[PDB]
Structure 1
Amino acid sequence: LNAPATVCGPKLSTDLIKNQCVNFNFNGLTGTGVLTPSSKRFQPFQQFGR
């Protein structure tokens, strides 16, 4: 949960949902909140932001 990952477990995916409070599981990072498109630019070695 700190870096880009390519070895995952056996879990199905789901389509994205915007502008609505949901439970989310991004690469094993679980939480609750609202997802919005961003204008931030990430470097190729970066996955999360704090």
Structure 2
Amino acid sequence: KCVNFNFNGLKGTGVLTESNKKFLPFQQFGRDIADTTDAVRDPQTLEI
């Protein structure tokens, strides 16, 4: 769903799709080729 975001101060607009790639357990978020945020895990939950 095309919604707004608020993930510990990180804001954006997009939809939610599950990530098939592996992730670090101590990682908060990752970056794309253009160095903006692309995959944010739930603090309260945890699904990358």
User: Which residue is equivalent to 1:37?
Assistant: 18
Letter in 2 for 1:25: N
Q: TM-score, normalised by structure 2?
A: 0.52
Q: Which runs of 5+ in 2 are unaligned?
A: 32-48
User: Any idea what SS the aligned residue of 2:6 has?
Assistant: strand
**In 1, distance between residues paired with 2:18 and 2:26?**
20
- How large is the RMSD of aligned CA atoms in angstroms? 1.2
Query: For the residues of structure 2 that align with 1:47 and 1:39, how far apart are their CA atoms?
Result: 17
* Residue 8 of structure 2 corresponds to residue 27 of structure 1: yes
Look up the SS of the partner of 2:29 in the other structure. Answer: coil
Map of 1:46 onto structure 2: 27
- TM-score normalized with structure 1 length: 0.50
Larger Rg: 1
Larger RCO, structure (CA 8 Å, separation 6 or more): 1
